Amino acid sequence: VAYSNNSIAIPTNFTISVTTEILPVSMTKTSVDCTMYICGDSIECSNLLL
Amino acid sequence: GVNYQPFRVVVLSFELLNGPATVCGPKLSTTLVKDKCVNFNFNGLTGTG
Numbered sequence: 001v002a003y004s005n006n007s008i009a010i011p012t013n014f015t016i017s018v019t020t021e022i023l024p025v026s027m028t029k030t031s032v033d034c035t036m037y038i039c040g041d042s043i044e045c046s047n048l049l050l
Numbered sequence: 051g052v053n054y055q056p057f058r059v060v061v062l063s064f065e066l067l068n069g070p071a072t073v074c075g076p077k078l079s080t081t082l083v084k085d086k087c088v089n090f091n092f093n094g095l096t097g098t099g
């Protein structure tokens with residue numbers, strides 16, 4: 001920057017700029033069946049899971 | 051004495067589910083059921099599907 005005690009710079013023109021800002025609002029909602037994942041629909045399993 | 055008496059030993063080595071099996075236990079086969087939820091016993095593999 002050129003700096004002086006008696007010097008200033010003043011804009012004689014302007015520019016209009018449009019910019020995009022992206023913010024995540026939500027994430028996928030998920031539900032898990034505990035017996036289906038661990039027992040895999042086994043009758044013998046889930047007796048232990050009680 | 052029994053400790054010194056001769057003993058005949060037979061050792062059986064085998065794999066079960068993996069591979070085609072020409073040796074099977076004495077269970078009668080049943081007609082195949084498809085498109086329904088059923089308990090199945092294919093070559094000693096048991097599952098519900």
Ligand SMILES: *[C@@H]1O[C@H](CO)[C@@H](O[C@@H]2O[C@H](CO)[C@@H](O)[C@H](O)[C@H]2NC(C)=O)[C@H](O)[C@H]1NC(C)=O
Nearest residue numbers: 008009010011012013014015016017018019020
């Ligand atoms: C400020 O800037 C704008 C452009 O960014 C200037 O407008 C241009 O003027 C020239 C002629 O001098 C034209 O050929 C361009 O087509 C114009 N641009 C647009 C987008 O219209 C404007 O003249 C400048 N103002 C000053 C004070 O210099």
